[PDB]
Amino acid sequence: MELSFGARAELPRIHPVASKLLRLMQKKETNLCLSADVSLARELLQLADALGPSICMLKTHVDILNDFTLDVMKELITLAKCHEFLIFENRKFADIGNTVKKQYEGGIFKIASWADLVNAHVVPGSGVVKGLQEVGLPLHRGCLLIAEMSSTGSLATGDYTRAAVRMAEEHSEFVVGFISGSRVSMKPEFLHLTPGVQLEAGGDNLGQQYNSPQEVIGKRGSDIIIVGRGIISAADRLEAAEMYRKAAWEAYLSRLG
Amino acid sequence: MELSFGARAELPRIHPVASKLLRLMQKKETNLCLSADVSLARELLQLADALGPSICMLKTHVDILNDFTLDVMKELITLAKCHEFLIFENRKFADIGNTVKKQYEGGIFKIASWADLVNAHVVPGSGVVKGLQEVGLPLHRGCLLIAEMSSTGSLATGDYTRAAVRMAEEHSEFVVGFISGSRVSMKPEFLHLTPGVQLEAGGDNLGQQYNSPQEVIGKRGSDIIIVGRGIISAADRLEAAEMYRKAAWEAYLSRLG
Ligand SMILES: *c1cc(=O)[nH]c(=O)n1[C@@H]1O[C@H](COP(=O)(O)O)[C@@H](O)[C@H]1O
Ligand SMILES: [Cl-]
């Protein structure tokens, strides 16, 4: 009952942004999302260009980009179109509906204007989704709900995770998936993206816990690995990205049969 | 026995930021925080100056400020020092430790460089606090933990709320209190700040729910009301600020005896 990414792109209830992503995943043989956790535009753009062919998605961190401008994002969009990847902004929206609407659409960042995908916490209740949707729906954007977190002590467990899944189901015109550590929905229209991924066992000094691509994709049933430091800290970020891409792709192929 | 704000300001285990806030609350007879939910610097600085005398705190929304610069924040600080109120940035930090550290210190906004107070969601586990504290402690800052939310379908209930209180207790060198709808800790060194406050019954059309100053300060035992639209959308903003200040203050006096 496992389907390829390319077949999932054709599912009757699939959102257009999800279909676009699934098609490029299949085309490029990648289910790797780069977490571009860097402070300078030059580095962001150079990683985007060099690793573009290896990734299905680049996760931006505009709240840490010391030299953000909208022109930087225009250049990133050019690279995304060229190399074929989606732009996912990291910011974990987590406020009442009316607030997150403005945080998404406006300020200096104007996130909705350039991000294909955003993510939201479900702790406020579904108003968080509803607010983001008022902005992103006509822009053909999608949203991921944070159903589980990778960090030590995470409270996104049990009934909380179930609430996230229900909320996604009830807002499928805009919610395209989850940030989670494993498959949390049985519905194949939903994407599972998993951060906290490295080839080596370990964690960091501030509560991050790591699992491998083979574990996350192969055994836990997620779709896409989100990798920051496992790539960013490497001497050769391109080689690192290729190792992560192969790991995640081959784990996916093995669950297909 | 309930202590006055002035007496709480002198408690041996009080955090310096909380002491500063409690002293000016007592001095100015105000336990009102203005939520400065505006898009333009001119509007933020106008409200800060006009309403400064009536408030103990101004909650900024830098993620919606279309013309943010550091010079705007220098000028806001000058108003805060003149009128005597603290600056509390709204952004509900909600990510792993390593990420929120950078979101707090860096980017274009450099929140730690001008906000007295920040707030965090507890969903990621205690790393969210550890990460923020690594930046906030050197900068003499404080943090509030979001123990309850004002919105419909909030998951910040029960064991989640209890987890927030334990996290605060264990990080009392940085955490000075809570965003909550009610008193959640019995320790008088912690502040309670409550959003979703208006004089009349109701909500917004994106899940916000409202309670009155008398209910939240008097019956529910909170310390400070956070008010945005109840003031900002009024014809006469100074009069509205004064109505909320008087309401919150009298509720406090009555609980005190
Ligand atoms: C988001 C949600 C979550 O549960 N765990 C996370 O780590 N994140 C974000 O993903 C990235 C992890 O990066 P790294 O540990 O691979 O360097 C990071 O951007 C974090 O905010
Ligand atoms: Cl709030």
Q: How many angstroms is it from A150 CA to the middle of ligand 1?
A: 7
Among A27, A81, A92, A219, the active-site one is A92
DSSP A112: G
Please check whether residue A24 is in contact with residue A85, taking contact to mean a CB–CB distance below 8 angstroms. yes
* Cβ atoms B96, B134 nearer than 8 A: no
Count of domains observed in chain A: 1
Q: Which helix (H) or strand (E) holds B250?
A: helix B237-256
B chain contacts of residue A204, beta-carbon cutoff 8 Å? 97-98
Is the distance from CB of B137 to CB of B105 less than 8 angstroms? no
- Residue A73 makes CB contacts below 8 A (sequence gap 6+) with A113, A114
Contact B96 A125 (CB under 8 A): no
Question: What CA–CA distances, in Å, run from A179 to B24, B37, B55?
Answer: 43, 29, 39
Rg of chain A on CA atoms, in Å: 17
Which one, of A94, A28, A93, lies nearest residue A57 by Cα?
A28
Read off the amino acid at residue A232.
I
A206, A171 contact by CB (below 8 A): no
Residue B4's contacts (CB-CB under 8 Å, 6 or more residues apart) are B26, B256
Instruction: Decide the pairing of beta strands B224-227 and B32-35.
Output: parallel
Closest chain B C-alpha to A118 CA, distance in angstroms: 14
Resolution, expressed in angstroms to one decimal:
1.3
User: What is the number of other CB atoms lying within 10 angstroms of the CB of residue B186?
Assistant: 8
Residue with the smallest CA separation from ligand 1 atom 4 is A149
Question: Residue A230 corresponds to which amino acid?
Answer: G
Indicate the helix (H) or strand (E) that contains B194.
strand B191-194
* Chain B interface test: which of A151, A152, A161 (most B C-beta within 10 Å): A151
Q: How far apart are CA B202 and CA B226, in angstroms?
A: 16
DSSP letter for B3, please: P
Q: B96, B166, B204: best mutation site toward chain A, by most A Cβ within 10 Å?
A: B96
Structure letter (DSSP) for residue A230: H
Q: For residues B41 and B68, is the Cβ–Cβ distance under 8 A?
A: yes
Question: Which token pair is A22?
Answer: 């699934």
Contacts of B31 by beta carbon, 8 Å cutoff, 6+ apart: B5, B25, B56, B217, B223, B224, B225, B245, B248, B249, B252
d(Cα B112, Cα B135) in Å, to the nearest integer?
7
Amino acid at B65: L
Can you give the length of chain B in residues? 257
Atom of ligand 1 nearest to the CA of B95: 21
- Does A28 qualify as catalytic in the annotation? no
In this complex, do B102 and A61 lie within 8 Å of one another by their Cβ atoms?
yes
Residue B250 CB-density burial (10 A; 0-12 exposed, 13-18 middle, 19+ buried): middle
Strands (E), chain A: 32-35, 57-60, 86-93, 117-121, 142-146, 175-179, 191-194, 224-227
Nearest to A59 by CA among A181, A184, A173, A227: A227
> Cβ separation of B207 and A130 shorter than 8 Å?
yes
Nearest CB among B63, B101, B163 relative to A103 is that of: B63
Contact B124 A163 (CB under 8 A): no
- Identify the CATH number of the domain in which residue A207 sits: 3.20.20.70
CB A168 within 8 A of CB A133: no
Interatomic CA distance for residues B15 and B18, integer angstroms: 5
Six token digits for residue B111: 């929140």
Instruction: Determine the Cα–Cα distance for residues A158 and A165; give it in Å rounded to an integer.
Output: 11
Distance CA B18, CA B22 (A): 6
- Sequence-separated (6 or more) residues with CB below 8 Å from residue A197: A210, A211, A212, A213, A216, A225, A226, A227, A230, A244
- Quote the CA–CA distance of A66 and B125 in Å, as a whole number: 27
Give residue B200's domain range.
1-257
User: DSSP string spanning A51-109?
Assistant: HGGG-SEEEE-GGG-TT--HHHHHHHHHHHHHHT-EEEEEEEE-S-HHHHHHHHH-TTT
Which ligand has its closest atom nearest to the C-alpha of A94? 2
Ligand nearest to the CA of B93: 1
Write out residues with Cβ below 6 Å of ligand 1: A 35, 37, 90, 149-151, 179, 195-196, 208, 226-230; B 95-96, 99
